[PDB]
């Protein structure tokens, strides 16, 4: 999210990391998209654009949002 904030037109959104133990060695390498280290999945949900539009910048704020929504749940 920070890399998306710095460059939205270039850096792709990432949804979640992919920890599948049945993955092969080319499979781990071919899914480190978005300038990441581990195997990650590209986000197409649009929450990156929405959260950049509403002023969320740092992942600390997203952590606070997650814990607040867990509390309200």
């Amino acid at each position: 999210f920070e890399q998306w904030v710095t460059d939205p037109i270039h850096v792709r959104p990432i949804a979640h990391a992919i920890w599948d133990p049945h993955f092969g060695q080319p499979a781990v390498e071919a899914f480190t998209r978005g300038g990441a280290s581990g195997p990650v999945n590209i986000a197409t949900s649009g929450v990156y654009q929405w959260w950049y539009t509403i002023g969320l910048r740092s992942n600390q704020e997203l952590y606070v949002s997650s814990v607040f929504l867990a509390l309200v749940s």
Binding site: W19, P21, Y63
Partner: protein
């Protein structure tokens, strides 16, 4: 952790969490549900 203090994720969090929720959690769900549906009276 710095700037991540709510629900601190370790580096081994996926490698540990994925097999309980793909392995142990479905097994407990299966056993509990099977004891539920087969319960007499």
């Amino acid at each position: 952790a710095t700037e991540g203090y709510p629900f601190v994720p370790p580096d081994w969090a996926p490698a540990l969490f994925v097999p309980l929720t793909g392995l142990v959690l479905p097994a407990v769900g299966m056993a509990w549900a099977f004891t539920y549906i087969q319960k007499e009276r």
